[PDB]
Amino acid sequence: GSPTFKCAVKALFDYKAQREDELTFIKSAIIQNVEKQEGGWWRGDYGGKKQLWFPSNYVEEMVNPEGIHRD
C-alpha cells in the first residue's frame, strides 16, 4: 500500500459520507493522524478535508506492521 509516518490505518470496509465530519472513504483507504474519540470514532485527513471521522468499527491500525523508509 503506502507505509508512511504518523499513525495511519487501512479502512477494512466501505463508508459513504464523503464530507460530513466523516468521509465516504472506501476499503483500502489510508487515513493519517488517527486517535479514537468519544468511544470508537477515529480522526485523520483523507482528501481535501483534514481530520473528519471514521468508526472504530470501520478502521484498523493496518493489520500489517513492517514498513520501509523512503529516501
Number of independent structural domains in the chain = 1
CB-based contacts of 33: which residues, under 8 Å, 6+ apart?
6, 7, 43, 44, 45, 51
Asked if 52 and 20 count as a contact pair (C-beta separation under 8 A), the reply is yes
AA letter at 36: K
> What determination technique applies here?
NMR
What sign results for the dihedral spanned by CA atoms 56, 54, 1, 12? Answer: positive
Reading the block at residue 20, the C-alpha cell is: 460530513
Could you tell me the residue range of the domain that residue 9 belongs to? 1-71
**Residue 68 to residues 5, 11, 20, 43: CA-CA distances in angstroms?**
10, 21, 33, 24
Give the whole-angstrom CA distance, residue 3 versus residue 45: 15
The enclosing domain of 65 has a CATH number of 2.30.30.40
9 C-beta neighbours (distance < 10 Å), count:
22
Strands (E), the chain: 41-42, 54-55
